[PDB]
Design a protein around this ligand. Structure first.
Ligand SMILES: [Mg+2]
Ligand SMILES: [Mg+2]
Ligand SMILES: [Mg+2]
Lengths: 329, 299
């Protein structure tokens, strides 16, 4: 609709084309950078890249930089590419870990080329992003390495808990680490290199981590009560991963919670069990307690973004937060 | 023995001791840095610290940081190749490798953006070597030229970086940094050609199980040379190279292609020693000399 850029309606086509141009420049950079790789990477490298992505983080970086005097600064496009490359790397690695066959509506990188070619593809994304971020200076470099480290402890935290745990507190530490910090960094990078005041930078950075925690939580609710609008439904069920709505549903009481407690104990290979467990979780009070927490996070973000200056980028960010909790995929 | 550090005999028990401290500082930094998330023979550490012997400040903290970053990237690639195509272990391969890259990312961030560009490139080269390898195997194709490119990328490139970073951060001159970098490039190439040669002559008590490259069908230099031969037992080895596999080895070790592979390891040795001769006449150049020899003559 030309007022929508990357799933988000921005109200105006003049403004949306400016943001679209910025998101388009983040993508030209990745397309340039990846395409320059040795012949032997090009299949796996562009696989997830060719097939569409939500483009959420390039948007968030671009929308954050709109809080600045030079939102179109070239260093913002660079920082916009670093963020999305790291995120792409983790999709290659996640899809091998979750043994996922399908990603972004296409064959997942590993279902196409096998686990090792997938792992390496992600590695090469990490190198490329490392090289890109060094262009932005010592502090940008420190930011992205702190964020990448904190991302991985999130992934490790999640894995440690599944192998043993069911702890809301720990889950909230996971989603903040494995998703929030990267968008936290993207907000901090777009504030920085668009020229926003130190305060706005901190405010945009705070905002990205909250938006990132929210976005992951909506992704875990979508995994349970969506039906093939995500990108395969109920993956958390099958992998025995216990996200927020399952965790609450297990703290529940009654015959339903009883069944779930035995179903969600470890992985599920039976298809007709996932259908039953998806029905149970979809109906549980646990799922509505988790929609609440989601809305609570949305409110922390809209509060954070309500103390940003009244500029079009503050409205645009507000629609992004709303999109983040209201979308269905 | 007292004069041996990380497998290389440096002739001098006193120099080997100073080198060991450098290697153990690296080992200790890998310990303090890897310890907590919510709480995994040291050739590349050793190569870093010997490079830095050419510089004025061999013991610089930056040198120790670079040694750790190198070996962490090294290990991360080891974990990642233990991913096979059971999920519990695969997950531990990927994350352990990813936690090592994250921690290297943090450490190199302290070494600064030029040290970030260097490490980023060599990992990209490193990963490229692995793809070439992994994908040269799937096609069953057998070029010496893809294999030589493989080892320069997969193995030679990270030791190149070890010499360059040991060079810069010991305070070596610009010419010396690039010379160390060219050095580690050939040393890592040859080190890998020796690894592949070893896989066919070694035994388990004297190493890993032999012929694991044969089992996976990874065709290394002695193989690629041996497949080009024309003898009575060639076709037998042509077919065998897709526990009977113990018969491919015994064909491989008495092959003239194997001795060809050893000639080339030597030609890489000569190249590395010429790089060495162009360095200052200091004890560290001697130590590097002993490393080059150990690189091409172990088992
Ligand atoms: Mg659009
Ligand atoms: Mg996506
Ligand atoms: Mg709790």
């Amino acid at each position: 609709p030309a007022t929508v850029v990357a799933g988000v309606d921005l109200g105006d086509a003049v403004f949306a084309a400016a943001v679209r141009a910025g998101v388009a420049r983040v993508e030209q950079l990745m397309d340039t950078e990846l395409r320059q790789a040795d012949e032997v990477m090009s299949d796996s490298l562009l696989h997830l890249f060719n097939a569409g992505g939500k483009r959420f983080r390039p948007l968030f970086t671009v929308l954050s930089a709109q809080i600045g005097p030079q939102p179109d600064a070239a260093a913002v496009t660079v920082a916009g590419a670093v963020i999305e490359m790291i995120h792409l790397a983790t999709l290659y690695h996640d899809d091998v870990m979750d043994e996922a066959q399908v990603r972004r509506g296409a064959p997942s990188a590993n279902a196409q080329w096998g686990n090792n070619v997938a792992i390496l593809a992600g590695d090469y994304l990490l190198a490329t992003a490392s090289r890109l971020v060094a262009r932005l200076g010592p502090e940008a470099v420190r930011i992205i390495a702190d964020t990448f480290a904190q991302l991985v402890t999130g992934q490790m935290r999640e894995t440690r808990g599944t192998s043993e745990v069911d702890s809301i507190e720990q889950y909230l530490k996971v989603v903040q680490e494995k998703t929030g910090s990267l968008i936290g960094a993207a907000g901090r990078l777009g504030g920085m290199f668009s020229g926003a005041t130190d305060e706005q930078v901190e405010r945009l950075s705070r905002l990205g981590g909250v938006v990132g925690t929210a976005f992951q939580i909506a992704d875990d609710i979508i995994d349970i009560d969506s039906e093939s609008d995500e990108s395969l439904p109920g993956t958390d069920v099958r992998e025995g991963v216990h996200t927020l709505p399952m965790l609450y549903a297990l703290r529940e009481s009654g015959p339903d919670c009883a069944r779930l407690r035995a179903l969600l104990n470890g992985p599920v290979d039976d298809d007709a069990e996932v259908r039953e467990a998806l029905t149970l979780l979809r109906a549980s009070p646990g799922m509505a307690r988790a929609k609440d927490v989601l809305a609570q996070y949305a409110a922390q973000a809209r509060h954070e973004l309500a103390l940003l200056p009244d500029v079009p980028g503050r409205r645009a960010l507000a629609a992004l937060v709303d999109y983040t909790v209201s979308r269905h995929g």
